[model samples]
Target: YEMSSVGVINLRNMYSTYDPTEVKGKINEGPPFSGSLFYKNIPYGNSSIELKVEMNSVEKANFFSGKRVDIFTLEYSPPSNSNIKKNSYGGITLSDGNRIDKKNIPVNIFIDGVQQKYSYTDISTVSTDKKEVTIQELDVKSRYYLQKHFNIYGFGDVKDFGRSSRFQSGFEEGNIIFHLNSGERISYNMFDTGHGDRESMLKKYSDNKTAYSDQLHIDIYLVKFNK
Candidate 1:
């Protein structure tokens, strides 16, 4: 009368507690139409009966008493993708010659194909007030990008007049300063004016506006300032 984690099975194992012929509770033959178990000999002339057995039990039987039959059932589904192990190289790694620190990298903060880096330069030395990121200069294109997407990058005006004025001048003159908490200042300069692309310099003298735009399109920023 006990249930297993799996479905119920034959009561052969319970033979230790009770015999098959014994009934612990009363049994009354009040109903005469109910079924009963009986052993019968199978036909010997029939060669078509195929039975496969496993675990000392008959797996299948085609023949039964002419008037009664019993059957068992099982349920299943098609195999899943999980059933087959997969191989992939998409995980992050330190072996691919990528020298950047994973902890310091920002998410979805790429400028062009490269990730944009940030730093803070000014802060209250005595008070618990948060450190301020000072702007030393803003490259013109960088300024444009900020004006277009400042809200998205979590940047805001520092509220200091001198710093604000200098930031404005940097953007106008293509020399912007953005400071970091580590005392590192990010200075943006006119295209081809800094050390990023020497070729940009040649193009700048050849044609200033066109060269500037082209430099912005292809160049990336660095942690160090030009001056």
Candidate 2:
């Protein structure tokens, strides 16, 4: 059965720090500091801050403009309250008569209780397709701390800091260090788990809010479209 009064759902915003490789030499010192936090954008300096949206109809998809807008998803329903929670991954039927594996149902976008319109490209075949929007010049700041003069290679040797076998293990694996233009070396070990794994460490940093957190507010436009 089709559900009415679609609920408002909030999704986690995703981001990553910008780290560029300089093929040439580090001539001298630089400001904004060499290890300053920045978002990784597209080539030609086009900020690659993208928003992923899943919708049931291509018509309702017209609500998003290339402009800045507030976005929302279907509100999360607890397993105890929703029948969709019976399975590990709940499935929903789309207007196209296709079923999508969704944890929750997301119907439409509304701001100020008004529905919005968007323009989207069809990225679906015989299955469900997600519409993506790119907000240009979007600025997303990193919340992780950049520890200057951080010792990644020698982290294991520092006995004064109370290094345990677990902490020393991370140094044994060796981690990458960023030499800032300010003559300061920084390590991406924002949340040192002592595993010495850059990938896992970064993952933990993204998921862990106590490490860093920030917010952005913008006015978005939306229009209603029907096929």
Candidate 3:
């Protein structure tokens, strides 16, 4: 009598086979940067710079248009917190579902909320360390790509102090330094582990705060400019 009540759930159809190369391309489209409490979009060029959103990048258009926006987190292993974690390889995920294996991750990030969606250049280019620094090498043409996703604000470097009168405008803050060989160095300070209510979060950045922690993500976009 119990045999009649038995049920079977087949999983053969559940798993779809895909070409490894196509899958690799999809994964390449995912997040590439890592850091705690990162702002999905921090200006890379003139903070006030503005550009028209194109059809190729809809999510970016939504941001330019001021729509409800969000970022995603990638996880290499099981997360300590069940919330906001994706089955990623070392805090990075592929646009496709193929998770990366261990030991091959060129970029290791503690926080990766920048799930995919990108511009022309690679986030892997930026690097910052007190002892030694590796400047990124980006082509001049990539300027168009940076213009769409970022704008400089609060310009400052060894050589000059925002001498270029021509500026990009938008809701950003910083001055940009163009380089042919050495890319600009990325800099910022983190206060706390990224988690908490708004008020609590604000406290971490206040009072010259240090020893605090938080998780954050950044959003990158791509665009072209005319000479």
Candidate 4:
């Protein structure tokens, strides 16, 4: 009886085999860069005094108006929790009835209650650790292929502060810097394991009263800027 059930369920007629590469031709508009908790989409442009999102880009749409966003996350591995752990990877599912490795995931949703949502198949794992520091643009292209066709939610980086005339965003400090061949430099702090939260934490800030301890979070969003 179990073998028969297995054979019937083994059929994968519902999988979306939509090849992202096959999505050729002019993409119409560049992929939308909305928001993510750990990933901040900073302004990219020449090393001039002002860096507009449209400068390095190929569009004339006004700032914010031309930009839109969506959200995405990966499937979680075994041993995870929901309750108050909003920022963990393996974001809430958006839709389901999909299969992989002879298993069917029948639901999708967002963790932090973000209304906009999406899901993808090609990815392998979820978010974890202090994985929310730098600005993640190019790194997300391939990963975002299915997402484009799917989407995270990370924080702000230098670009977000470019127009504000700030040396640093306080979100991170760069006492240490790394130099590269392209004549680039980057900086940030290190982590001390076991010296942090011992479990999932979701708490509302109540003034600066007895503030203490270290956790992690940043706000990202999904929105449409009208043309």
Q: Best-fitting candidate, measured by TM-score? A: 2
Residue 212 lDDT in model 1? 13
Please, what are the lDDT tens digits per residue for candidate 2 over residues 140-159?
11110111111211232324
lDDT of each: 0.21, 0.21, 0.21, 0.21
lDDT, candidate 3, at 123: 43
- Estimate, for each residue in 176-217, the C-alpha lDDT of model 4 and write its tens digit: 222222444332121111122311110110010110001212
Give the range of the ten consecutive residues with the poorest summed lDDT in model 3.
7-16
Writing each residue's lDDT as its tens digit, candidate 3 over 23-141 gives: 11212222322212112222222341111111223332232232221112111212343233222211111223322221111221211232333432454332211111111111111
Give the poorly placed runs of model 3, Cα more than 4 Å off.
1-58, 61-94, 104-184, 192-227
Give each model a TM-score. Answer: 0.16, 0.18, 0.16, 0.17
RMSD of each candidate relative to the true structure = 35.0, 25.1, 24.1, 24.0
TM-score of candidate 4 against the unseen true structure: 0.17
After the best TM-score superposition of candidate 1, give how far the Cα of residue 105 lies from its true spot, in angstroms. Answer: 9.1
Residue-level lDDT tens digits of model 1 in 1-227: 22431111121121111111111112212221112122122121232111111111121111111222211101111123221211111111111222222111111223333455433222211111111100110122233343333211112333211212212211212233333334444443432233222222222211111111111122233222122
Model 4 bad stretches (over 4 Å): 1-114, 118-214
Residue 201 alpha-carbon offset, candidate 1, angstroms: 4.5
